[PDB]
Amino acid sequence: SSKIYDNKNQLIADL
Amino acid sequence: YPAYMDNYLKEVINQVEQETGYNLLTTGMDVYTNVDQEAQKHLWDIYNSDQYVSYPDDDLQVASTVVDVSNGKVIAQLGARHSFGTNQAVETNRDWGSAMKPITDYAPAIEYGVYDSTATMVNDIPYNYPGTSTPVYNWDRAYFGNITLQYALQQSRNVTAVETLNKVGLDRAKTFLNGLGIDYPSMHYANAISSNTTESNKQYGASSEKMAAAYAAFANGGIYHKPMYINKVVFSDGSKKEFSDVGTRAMKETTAYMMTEMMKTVLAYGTGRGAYLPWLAQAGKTGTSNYTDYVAPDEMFVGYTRKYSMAVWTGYSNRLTPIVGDGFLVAAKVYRSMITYLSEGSPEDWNIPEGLYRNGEFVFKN
Ligand SMILES: [Ba+2]
DSSP states (O other): OOEEEOTTSOEEEEO | OOGGGHHHHHHHHHHHHHHHSOOTTTSOEEEEEOOOHHHHHHHHHHHHSSSSOOOSSSOOEEEEEEEETTTTEEEEEEOOOOOOOOOTTTOOOSOOGGGGHIIIIIHHHHHTTSOSBTTOEEEESOEEOTTSSOEEOOTTSOOOEEEEHHHHHHTTOHHHHHHHHHHHOHHHHHHHHHTTTOOOSSOOGGGGGOSOSSOOOTTSSOOHHHHHHHHHHHHTTSEEOOOBOEEEEEETTSOEEEOOOOOEEOSOHHHHHHHHHHHHHHHHTSTTGGGOOTTSOOEEEEEEOOOOOOOBSEEEEEEEOSSEEEEEEEEOSSTTSOBOGGGGGHHHHHHHHHHHHHHTTOOOOOOOOTTEEEETTEEEEO
16 A cells, blocks of 8 residues: 655545 | 546656655555645646636647746646546657757857847848758748847747757757756757657657756756655655755856746747736746648647746647647646746746846846
8 A cells, every 4th residue: 555645745645 | 546646646656666666556655745736636627627728629638747946846747638547748759849949049059158148139031951951931931130039039930049059059959958858869950949850769859847847947047856756755664765856057047047038028028928927927938849741730838937837738639630720829828827826826036147237128148
């Protein structure tokens, strides 16, 4: 599981 | 994950692999990116509604990248309108044409001493490519004779551009472009107004990604930063590593300022009028590619403020399907809408740097 976050450090995806 | 993030995620996966060596899809790890979620959603709305810009049909494509000029951070990127498939925003398969003129011809000409003022005279008259009887025609098919360098850029003369590259030389033009993240297997005078004169691999030519990063160097004083989609990676072992581009000098601050002053007029009185905003200090350049042997395969626009740089490409999936009529308006309108969104809540003007002095509407080197 690789969680991706935007520039405000909020979760946007789980790959 | 949301559809509007597909293009960005693909590039995030690629950069994570380049910087760490791992594929985040097969190796678990947390990655903090530079995408401005609201800005990204806004770009999608610009592309996929009639709210901000009107399109001639639903087939016309748009691909753009928005960069934070201070550090090369990609804040938004969308490669198409209407998993991890081809992202046109980073593909270099299309010709950015005349949009190449500022970074290929004029910037290095100023940097290297070919021109020392935005008032320097140049001659827009019938001209053939060096070494041939092959004419270089201006987009409007006219000639304005003896004019200022600034007017030459304002009205995007191809004649003046090609002769400028001839003066810069293919060697120096190549080096200057390399400093801005752009390269070609070999340089030719045709590249004065084209990024795709011949089929080349992905690393050569222009893309919205490269063009945004290139023009950002103008905006920030002459510093080039590679596109950055990531700022931090947290590996499963607990360690946390930050990622940032140190930057390199691509041109003198004097060169950046002079180029900016002229591209301001492109918008205020020139070909880029479609993107003009009276309340915003910004500079830009329209771009158009052409067929061989009014229609065109591609229509671009690149502009910037002291905060952001955005490069825009438009055209149809099959380059032989031409852009026609009001289709040529889209590029500048997509940019205009996005930069408004990004600036209205803001946005200082540039300040003439040391080494230059102003005389009315023109700027000269000391
Ligand atoms: Ba290419």
